[PDB]
Amino acid sequence: QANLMRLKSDLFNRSPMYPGPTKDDPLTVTLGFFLQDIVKVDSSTNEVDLVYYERQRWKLNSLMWDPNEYGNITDFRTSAADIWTPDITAASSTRPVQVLSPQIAVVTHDGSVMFSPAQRLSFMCDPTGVDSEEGVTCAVKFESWVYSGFEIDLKTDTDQVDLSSYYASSKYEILSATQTRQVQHYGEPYIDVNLVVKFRERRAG
Amino acid sequence: QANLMRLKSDLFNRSPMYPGPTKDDPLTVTLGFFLQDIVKVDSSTNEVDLVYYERQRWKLNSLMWDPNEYGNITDFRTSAADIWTPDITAASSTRPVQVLSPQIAVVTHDGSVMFSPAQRLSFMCDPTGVDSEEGVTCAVKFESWVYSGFEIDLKTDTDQVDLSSYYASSKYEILSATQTRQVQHYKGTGEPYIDVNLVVKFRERRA
Amino acid sequence: QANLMRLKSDLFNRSPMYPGPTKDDPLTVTLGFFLQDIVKVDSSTNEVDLVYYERQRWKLNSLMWDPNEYGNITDFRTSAADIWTPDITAASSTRPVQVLSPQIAVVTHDGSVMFSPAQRLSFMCDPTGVDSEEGVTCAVKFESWVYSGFEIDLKTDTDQVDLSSYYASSKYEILSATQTRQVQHYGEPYIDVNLVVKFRERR
Amino acid sequence: QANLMRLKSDLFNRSPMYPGPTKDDPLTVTLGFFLQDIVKVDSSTNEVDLVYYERQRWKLNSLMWDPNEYGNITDFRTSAADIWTPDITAASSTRPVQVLSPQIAVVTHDGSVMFSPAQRLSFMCDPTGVDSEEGVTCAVKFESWVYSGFEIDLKTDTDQVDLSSYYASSKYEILSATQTRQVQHYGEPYIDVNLVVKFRERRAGN
Amino acid sequence: QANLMRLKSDLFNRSPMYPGPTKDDPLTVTLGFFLQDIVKVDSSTNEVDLVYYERQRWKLNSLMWDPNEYGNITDFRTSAADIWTPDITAASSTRPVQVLSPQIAVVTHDGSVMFSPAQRLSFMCDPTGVDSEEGVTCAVKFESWVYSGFEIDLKTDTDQVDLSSYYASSKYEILSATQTRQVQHYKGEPYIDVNLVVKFRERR
Ligand SMILES: *[C@@H]1O[C@H](CO)[C@@H](O[C@@H]2O[C@H](CO)[C@@H](O[C@@H]3O[C@H](CO)[C@@H](O)[C@H](O)[C@H]3NC(C)=O)[C@H](O)[C@H]2NC(C)=O)[C@H](O)[C@H]1NC(C)=O
Ligand SMILES: C[N+]1(C)CCc2cc3c(cc2[C@H]1[C@@H]1OC(=O)c2c1ccc1c2OCO1)OCO3
Ligand SMILES: C[N+]1(C)CCc2cc3c(cc2[C@H]1[C@@H]1OC(=O)c2c1ccc1c2OCO1)OCO3
Ligand SMILES: C[N+]1(C)CCc2cc3c(cc2[C@H]1[C@@H]1OC(=O)c2c1ccc1c2OCO1)OCO3
Ligand SMILES: C[N+]1(C)CCc2cc3c(cc2[C@H]1[C@@H]1OC(=O)c2c1ccc1c2OCO1)OCO3
Ligand SMILES: C[N+]1(C)CCc2cc3c(cc2[C@H]1[C@@H]1OC(=O)c2c1ccc1c2OCO1)OCO3
Ligand SMILES: *[C@@H]1O[C@H](CO)[C@@H](O)[C@H](O)[C@H]1NC(C)=O
């Protein structure tokens, strides 16, 4: 307890909070999606509701420490309010994202941060053809709302969405789910991760 | 990092926040709408739901700096809570506006601020005739709720609503969408009031 | 900007906030309703939903200033959190009121305050007969939740509800709409403004 | 204004807030319900929605003053955040209580506090038989969530729910409505107020 | 009153708040569920709604005191905001949990804390077969979202969910309800959950 309180005091009370990236000090944020359930489909509004968690990883020099100066603490947990977090936004949401997990992040001695918010998201998707073998494909882009590619670069470690927590008795079967980095233009480049999900009705009973 | 922290400290910790415009120091706010989806229509209540983002631009002397004194930083991002933002309100909404984007703004060295809130809005609209070739026209005015034309002037850079992010598989097809400044008066008052009239003509998507 | 920051600093940072009226220093609050839409009717629950704004006016000595000492500023806008506001409540609501406008008020050099919250309100109303020529009448009382008539007096400037922003393609046509002060008893007297609205389905 | 600001300063800024009752300094909290409407019934989930206000009364030495030292002020209004309030909870709610009134209380010179929150409550109730002459009976217990009978003694002044603000054109007619203290044992006593409401669908002719 | 104000001042104003457990100072949190109602079932979305309260118990050295130094006060009540609370999360919820009780905890002189939040939870559950004698079984795991088994250990005092406040006129009858500690791994570090398993049917 004593060493951790010291470590947190040294990192957070002394310095101001990290103000975010700039053109000369850009930040790479790595995203991975863990899809849990397609909960609902609305064919009259073309809205589909997903439950997932979203692993976010980035690294800052100002959060580094030597474990030896702090009782060999290699990492700790702290409220996401205590640190800067990236402003990752679904571009085609139709309702505010509903938060399903505590807003708490893991900080490691090398300055790495891991934050895994669980979310329910309504987004624009035409479900026509969902009761077929071919199913239906829908997509939603995740991006920083305010930072260009020169400030925040997004990437994934893998192109495959993790389906290992996908609810086995969901009304919808996942045929494929990918997560792919894209470069958009508008004067200046912006980056997104395109979440593409192909699915169909699983018929039961 | 070091230079940006200094710049933010110099602008925000020293001064109080901008208290808003007055009759002798008015503010011009420029609006542009980027329509993403007509999500639903309710013909039993005459409510229609829009998803859009709304680019807002204004300029303040107290947010100016010289890039040379701060490592050639020309702009930065910061929480909208750190600065004054205009109170732009839909005049004929039927539900509170739902916020769909982070409350973060871009501040430029000349004192310009750009803030682009994404929103879902329910507003008053009779959709009768939406299932026809002519479609239906609906309108909603955006205005400062509390400031007259002598304190906040609203304008647009273009009369055409940007449809470039409009959802291609929406249930509703956009036939036209305009955004037009209007000057209103009222018989007793000694002041004009300004709005931006968003006018959208649309129909159910055909086969 | 500089003068306004000074004025706000002088009024708000120096003094504590106005603590509200007392028996020896009562406050008159003037109310006026501007009805925009009857949005829906629920005949299975006897709830009706109204969209309106509500102009509220009162006056306090502690908010006065001389324009000459502050660059001829005659009035300003500020967050409703920065000042005392009256706690005007619908007596027969069935859901929390939904706020449709920024919580910002206008303060004038004489100490006058004007606050105009736009609201969506669900309230108790039997709509039976709404599909007829005579239509249906419903009423809702607005009152301070906590202050008696000896602390807050409510009144209206006019008996007639302003219908000038009423939505022309509403499903419901307004036949009449009045706003009238009432005195209630239970020992101490309490004041309300009774909003009475007669309406029908548009023909 | 000047005297009231002084009085509030003397009561709130000097002392810490009242930390709540203990076994050696118990508090009596009196409840009364004022039922306004049974708004809806859901026979597929056995949930019923009530609108009411709930008058809460208690008394604290630390909120006493002499009116003569403060311009003959006998009472004032203040935000419920400025004072301790009891944690009275419906035991069988199915949704968070929806607040319909400002969170403001009335404090009197003798240290009495009156707080009257208006609420919409969804609670567990089987409405089967509501469309009959006998109607249906449903009940919900109100209790302090954390305090025993040795810390908060909870009571009513009357066993009859006040129906004087009940909406005359409600879909549901109130046949009876009571509010009755129940004192339980298990060594320490635990208290609730049982709100029991018998009602039926309003009859045109029957 | 005077002694309690002193005690709270000494515990909360002097020290910083407990920062949470670490690998070298782990915390055991004991959970018990008190099921009140299965309120609804949605067979078109496979969501089921439960109302329950959840007794949570843990112990911290920094919240200890000697009753003799504080007028023989053995325990007190305080806002949950005044102390650290564990971030116990339903792993398969579909909506934010709705809070049905005041956020207030009981702290005892030995440093024990008891916190009993009442909740309405929507979670993933296929109700197909609920209208039968056998009924249907559904499960939801409760876990710390952020702490491994080396920081937070979860357990139960009993394997049986308390049904003593279960609503007698619910649309759904409880056939069985268990609460069981589980140890999970992934392809390195172990994480702990309490599996709430409920078998139920439509009331006949
Ligand atoms: C708010 O309104 C006030 C009147 O409506 C303005 O007051 C005026 O300010 C002027 C500028 O300082 C004064 O001018 C001066 O006049 C006197 C003789 O009256 C001369 O001796 C001075 O030389 C002359 N100024 C100069 C620079 O030579 C006016 O006298 C004065 N009028 C009044 C009080 O009635 C305020 O300036 C105005 N505030 C603003 C615009 O911020
Ligand atoms: C479309 N988005 C992702 C959000 C809204 C928006 C609205 C805009 C804009 C860019 C953007 C972008 C996004 O937001 C930015 O502020 C931004 C964006 C992308 C790339 C950028 C940006 O600033 C410099 O380079 O330029 C003028 O109006
Ligand atoms: C609807 N708004 C934008 C706000 C509230 C309001 C309240 C009113 C009114 C018009 C308005 C308008 C608008 O906003 C004003 O603040 C305002 C408005 C119009 C005309 C005015 C105003 O103040 C003095 O004369 O007429 C009488 O009471
Ligand atoms: C009905 N209202 C408006 C709200 C709730 C309420 C509940 C009550 C009561 C008065 C009131 C009034 C209103 O609220 C007050 O607190 C109050 C009210 C009116 C007059 C008063 C009051 O306190 C002293 O004099 O007396 C007993 O139970
Ligand atoms: C339902 N209430 C009133 C509140 C919460 C609660 C939570 C519980 C419990 C009983 C209760 C009761 C009430 O609150 C208590 O703390 C309590 C209660 C009743 C009986 C008790 C208690 O502690 C020892 O014996 O048993 C296990 O977890
Ligand atoms: C699935 N959860 C509950 C949340 C997200 C997550 C994301 C992960 C992970 C584990 C977890 C777990 C849980 O959250 C943690 O932070 C965590 C978790 C389990 C085990 C752990 C953990 O940190 C060290 O050992 O390992 C790599 O990326
Ligand atoms: C921390 O690591 C060192 C290096 O091996 C180890 O010997 C020591 O036991 C650890 N810390 C403390 C406080 O003993």
Ligand SMILES: *[C@@H]1O[C@H](CO)[C@@H](O)[C@H](O)[C@H]1NC(C)=O
């Ligand atoms: C506290 O405990 C002691 C030990 O029995 C007792 O004799 C004493 O009277 C108590 N004092 C107070 C202030 O409660």
Ligand SMILES: [Cl-]
């Ligand atoms: Cl940081």
Ligand SMILES: [Cl-]
């Ligand atoms: Cl500003």
Ligand SMILES: [Cl-]
């Ligand atoms: Cl004030």
Ligand SMILES: [Cl-]
């Ligand atoms: Cl108190």
Ligand SMILES: [Cl-]
């Ligand atoms: Cl703690």
